[PDB]
Amino acid sequence: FKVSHPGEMIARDLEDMGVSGRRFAHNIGVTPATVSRLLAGKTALTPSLSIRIAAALGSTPEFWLRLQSNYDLRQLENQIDTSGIVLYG
Template identity: 30%
Template sequence: MVSHSDSSQHPGTVLRKRFMGPHGLDVETLAADLGLPVNRLEDVLAGQRSITADMALRLARYFGTSPLYWMNLQSRFDLHVTGKVLAQEIERDVRPRLTRDVA
């Protein structure tokens, strides 16, 4: 299950802190075990790349989690970041349906 505190953390941070650290994994070992290029995993860990469906499937198999765990981490993070950036614009531009029905 994804916790609310994870929604503001990039999935790469969660991967490093909750999975790599406790298992003593370095980026080269994990990338090799996942069958991924080291630079792709480094980019995820640095918060510069998103977790893709392919990576979610690989991480799920490797760590015994579900692919949805990883995709949910990414979705929650994306919504958190986008919401912060676009909140005022969306509030200004989008008129809720209920407001129109009442008027």
């Protein structure tokens, strides 16, 4: 059904702090268009965004980027067929 994207987690941290999407965008050096797209799931949490987010929300850049990597794998593992691929010895 409807799945959860890593933008929802950025949003809950901003709501808990009373920081709007427009100040958060200006803070990380990005226009508010991208933050709205990010938080809604329209676009992906790129590695460069995981670097600014890490400097604003206080975790490792790998942490925020991992959320997008797992999101991509959860989507693609249902789509890519691996029956024809041979495991080597």
